Every structure is written in C-alpha cells, then in structure tokens.
Amino acid sequence: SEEAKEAIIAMLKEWYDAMNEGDMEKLRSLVDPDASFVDARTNQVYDKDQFLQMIKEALEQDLKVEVKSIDIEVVIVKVKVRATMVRNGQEHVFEVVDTYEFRRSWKIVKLVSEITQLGS
C-alpha cells in the first residue's frame, strides 16, 4: 500500500514536472483514455483530448506550475498548486486545487480543478 501510494505520488511529480517542461507526451501517457476533467468553478466537463488541447494552449502562454502540498485521501489525491501564465505580456497568477482520482499501472481517471486567479 505504501508502494501504491509512493507510485501515485511519483506520477504526480512527473505530471507537474512534465508541465513545466512542456512535455505533453508525458502527460498523455498518465491519463486513461476515458478520463473526465472537471472545471469546478464553471461546471465544465472535458474528455482527455479536449483537456489536452487546453493544456496545449496554456503551455503556449508559458504556463508554469509549482506544487505546494499533496494529500492522499481507487486513490484520491488533493494537490494544491501555484501557477502562472503570461497572456499578451501580462502575467496572471493562480492558486489551483487539483483533486485526482487514480484507478489501476495507475492512471488518472478523473480530475476536478478549482482555479482561483490571485492577481499578479
């Protein structure tokens, strides 16, 4: 079980590291093909290809992230992240709470993201 936990954590490290690297090949491999992605604040729901498309656009805006905390609670993990994006020369700063559902290799089958824009 500790191995299970340790593997999930390592994968979330890979996720966020790949995000800062801009390596979407690595992101694609961590997500189940039938996974659903939820924007909690807008109630919008996306499939994997739609989610990755949005990631691509954000990476084009210099999206960078830093993980602040990881809490393991099917494995459910809550990650708090600070993120920045540069949009038409104006940087925007965000605090995001990402709650993942991993299902067994372990794959992400669901993410709910609460996104708050903090102001630069």
Residues that bind ligand HCY (CB under 6 A): 19, 54-55, 58, 63, 65, 81, 83, 85, 94, 96, 98, 111, 113, 115
Instruction: Give 77 or 83: the residue with its C-beta nearer to ligand HCY.
Output: 83
21's CB contacts (< 8 A; 6+ apart) are: none
Element (H, E) at 117: strand 107-117
Instruction: Give 1 or 33: the residue with its C-beta nearer to ligand HCY.
Output: 33
**Shortest Cβ 47–ligand HCY spacing (Å):** 14
User: What's the residue count for the chain?
Assistant: 120
Instruction: Report CA-CA distances (Å) from 85 to 10, 57, 61, 76, 101.
Output: 25, 11, 6, 27, 26
Instruction: Give 7 or 99: the residue with its C-beta nearer to ligand HCY.
Output: 99
Q: Which residue has the tokens 């694609």?
A: 28
Using alpha carbons only, give the angle 17, 15, 6 rounded to the nearest 5 degrees. 105
**Shortest Cβ 83–ligand HCY spacing (Å):** 4
Nearest residue relative to ligand HCY (C-beta): 58
Q: Which residue has the tokens 């690297």?
A: 21
Instruction: Give 77 or 98: the residue with its C-beta nearer to ligand HCY.
Output: 98
**Shortest Cβ 1–ligand HCY spacing (Å):** 24
**Shortest Cβ 24–ligand HCY spacing (Å):** 11
